[PDB]
Design an enzyme around this catalytic site. Structure first.
Site, short mmCIF file in Angstrom:
data_model
loop_
_atom_site.label_atom_id
_atom_site.label_comp_id
_atom_site.label_asym_id
_atom_site.label_seq_id
_atom_site.Cartn_x
_atom_site.Cartn_y
_atom_site.Cartn_z
N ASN A 178 0.85 -1.18 0.00
CA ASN A 178 0.00 0.00 0.00
C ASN A 178 0.88 1.23 0.00
O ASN A 178 1.61 1.48 0.95
CB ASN A 178 -0.90 0.01 1.23
CG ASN A 178 -1.78 -1.20 1.29
OD1 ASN A 178 -2.58 -1.43 0.38
ND2 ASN A 178 -1.60 -2.01 2.33
N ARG A 192 0.85 4.47 0.47
CA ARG A 192 0.02 5.52 1.04
C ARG A 192 -0.04 5.35 2.55
O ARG A 192 0.32 4.30 3.08
CB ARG A 192 -1.41 5.44 0.50
CG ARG A 192 -2.11 4.10 0.76
CD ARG A 192 -3.62 4.28 0.93
NE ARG A 192 -4.29 3.12 1.54
CZ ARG A 192 -4.59 1.99 0.89
NH1 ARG A 192 -4.26 1.85 -0.39
NH2 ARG A 192 -5.21 1.00 1.52
N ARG A 200 -12.10 0.29 15.20
CA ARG A 200 -12.81 1.13 14.25
C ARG A 200 -14.25 1.31 14.69
O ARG A 200 -14.91 0.35 15.06
CB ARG A 200 -12.79 0.48 12.87
CG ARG A 200 -11.40 0.21 12.35
CD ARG A 200 -11.41 0.09 10.85
NE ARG A 200 -10.07 0.05 10.29
CZ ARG A 200 -9.83 -0.07 8.98
NH1 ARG A 200 -10.83 -0.12 8.12
NH2 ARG A 200 -8.57 -0.12 8.53
N1 LIG Z 1 -2.48 -16.75 -0.87
C1 LIG Z 1 -3.55 -16.48 -0.08
N2 LIG Z 1 -4.05 -17.40 0.78
C2 LIG Z 1 -5.11 -17.13 1.57
N3 LIG Z 1 -5.76 -15.95 1.56
C3 LIG Z 1 -5.36 -14.94 0.74
C4 LIG Z 1 -4.21 -15.16 -0.14
N4 LIG Z 1 -4.04 -14.02 -0.83
C5 LIG Z 1 -4.99 -13.14 -0.44
N5 LIG Z 1 -5.78 -13.69 0.50
C6 LIG Z 1 -6.94 -13.03 1.16
O1 LIG Z 1 -7.27 -11.81 0.51
C7 LIG Z 1 -7.14 -10.68 1.39
C8 LIG Z 1 -6.37 -9.57 0.68
O2 LIG Z 1 -6.96 -9.47 -0.63
P1 LIG Z 1 -6.64 -8.23 -1.58
O3 LIG Z 1 -5.23 -7.80 -1.25
O4 LIG Z 1 -7.03 -8.57 -3.00
O5 LIG Z 1 -7.70 -7.16 -1.03
P2 LIG Z 1 -7.34 -5.59 -1.12
O6 LIG Z 1 -8.66 -4.85 -1.04
O7 LIG Z 1 -6.50 -5.41 -2.36
C9 LIG Z 1 -6.34 -5.18 0.34
F1 LIG Z 1 -6.99 -5.53 1.44
F2 LIG Z 1 -5.22 -5.88 0.32
P3 LIG Z 1 -5.96 -3.41 0.40
O8 LIG Z 1 -7.29 -2.72 0.59
O9 LIG Z 1 -5.04 -3.27 1.59
O10 LIG Z 1 -5.32 -3.08 -0.92
C10 LIG Z 1 -6.48 -11.18 2.67
O11 LIG Z 1 -7.14 -10.63 3.82
C11 LIG Z 1 -6.66 -12.68 2.62
O12 LIG Z 1 -7.81 -13.06 3.37
CL LIG Z 2 -6.17 1.81 4.67
#
Ligand SMILES: Nc1ncnc2c1ncn2[C@@H]1O[C@H](COP(=O)(O)OP(=O)(O)C(F)(F)P(=O)(O)O)[C@@H](O)[C@H]1O
Ligand SMILES: [Cl-]
Length: 444
Positions: A288, A290, A336
């Protein structure tokens, strides 16, 4: 030092950023929607500009409107906060092309880390541990795609390279084709980019992230870690620092590689490296680029003001501290506060009739809300953050419990009661719950 900035965001974080500016003698420009005329940070700001109607697309995502505000107020820089345009490479670039400072990394760096395939390749190259995977996109050849699943070993997960989330667990060859087609089509319709990749799927990881800062003179530092495992629909509910069970040896190990990643990629400003943590092993998933919602916990345990460091970095000043001067002291927890329904978890907007903030030692309340303020229906449900610090985790927790009992917010429904249940939850008190725990406790 920067003369005047546009706070290109709203609610708690806008107030957060406003206080940093005031402390440093920076003049504030509050851009807001017609529905946010009475936000606390708007009412305190030096100059205010109304950039469009309630809906975000014509206000907080309106790139031309935000840049005009900068131009007409004589501002020199724009702080994008979190959400909205903060991870938008095109926006950061237009800010730079127009001649204002984007308080954040270079657009190129934002673009690199906003695509997961290219982000993982870079981390992997810099020696940050990633999840075993395709290490590149998947084509439409299912013989090859099956070969990649066998090599990784099941279960695997299919993932859009752009980013709510859009993912699919796969446990055998049978579900593979269909999980790729669907993930692909859902990324084409969402981010217009149909690229996907495959990772090994982890069953019971925790979420542990490292805060970093990098300035323009080559310096890059890590400020310990945060555990944000307590989630719902992949939305963080509680965060804490440091992460329970992380030894100083692990901290130093994962921290050093995060800092080296920053140097290799010419990172600048505040950043977070997100990891899944299982069996004592860190696996990269996302950067991230930011400030994050949950930055105040890292602040309480280090003493470092992360927003002020952002403003300093953007102005050409070097980091106020070296790695050797960063010590993890004590323990903080963030809850939160959401204007949400306790049974649906859908936003419950409305007029706050009575309000009381908690206070005392180790207690920090981050919110714009006040008695008689209306929570509008057009934006996120998170109206506030309650952060509590203590010499150890058990003290931090105990302060949270009492601070919550004192928090009064009448006129709308909130998750205060739910937070209190989590603070009383015996597994949370043991520490180290995984990312699925909160949903299994509630039955969701
Ligand atoms: N290899 C993996 N095994 C298990 N769960 C996973 C894996 N990769 C991702 N996840 C799940 O996906 C979530 C993160 O997904 P993703 O990163 O696409 O959401 P995003 O909304 O992109 C975010 F939360 F990261 P951010 O908002 O911080 O960018 C984690 O909380 C986890 O539960
Ligand atoms: Cl955030």
């Amino acid at each position: 030092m920067l003369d005047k900035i546009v706070i290109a965001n709203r609610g708690e974080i806008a107030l957060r950023i406003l206080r940093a500016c005031k402390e440093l003698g920076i003049k504030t420009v509050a851009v807001h929607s017609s529905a946010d005329r009475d936000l606390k940070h708007v009412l305190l700001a030096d100059e205010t500009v109304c950039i469009g109607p309630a809906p975000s697309v014509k206000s907080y995502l309106n790139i031309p409107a935000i840049i005009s505000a900068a131009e007409i107020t004589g501002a020199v820089a724009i702080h994008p906060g979190y959400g909205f345009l903060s991870e938008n490479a095109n926006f950061a670039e237009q800010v730079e092309r127009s001649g204002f400072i984007f308080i954040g990394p270079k657009a190129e760096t934002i673009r690199l880390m906003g695509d997961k395939v290219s982000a993982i390749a870079a981390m992997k190259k810099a020696g940050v541990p990633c999840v075993p995977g395709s290490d590149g996109p998947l084509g439409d050849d299912m013989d090859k795609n099956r070969a990649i699943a066998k090599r990784i070993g099941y279960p695997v997960i299919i993932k859009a390279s752009g980013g709510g989330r859009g993912m699919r667990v796969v446990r055998g060859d049978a579900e593979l084709a269909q999980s790729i087609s669907m993930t692909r089509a859902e990324a084409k319709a969402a981010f217009s980019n149909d690229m996907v990749y495959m990772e090994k799927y982890l069953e019971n990881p925790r979420h542990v992230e490292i805060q970093v800062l990098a300035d323009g003179q080559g310096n890059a530092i890590y400020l310990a870690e945060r555990d944000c495992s307590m989630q719902r629909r992949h939305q963080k509910v509680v965060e804490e620092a440091p992460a329970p069970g992380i030894t100083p040896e692990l901290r130093r190990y994962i921290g050093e590689r995060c800092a080296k990643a920053c140097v290799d990629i010419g990172y600048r400003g505040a950043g977070t490296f997100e990891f899944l943590f299982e069996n004592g092993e860190f696996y990269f998933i996302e950067m991230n680029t930011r400030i994050q919602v949950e930055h105040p916990v890292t602040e309480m345990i280090t003493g470092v003001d992360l927003i002020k460091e952002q403003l300093r970095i953007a102005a050409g000043q070097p980091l106020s501290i070296k790695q050797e001067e960063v010590h993890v002291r004590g323990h903080a927890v963030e809850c939160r506060i959401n204007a949400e329904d306790p049974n649906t978890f859908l936003p419950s907007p409305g007029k706050i009739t009575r309000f009381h903030a908690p206070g005392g030692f180790g207690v920090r309340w981050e919110s714009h809300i006040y008695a008689g303020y209306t929570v509008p229906p057009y934006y996120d449900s998170m109206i506030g953050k309650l952060i509590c610090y203590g010499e150890n985790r058990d003290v931090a927790i105990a302060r949270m419990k009492n601070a919550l009992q004192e928090l009064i917010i009448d006129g709308i429904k909130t998750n205060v009661d739910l937070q209190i249940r989590i603070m009383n939850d015996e597994n949370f008190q043991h520490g180290g719950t995984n990312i699925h725990y909160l949903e299994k406790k509630l039955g969701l």
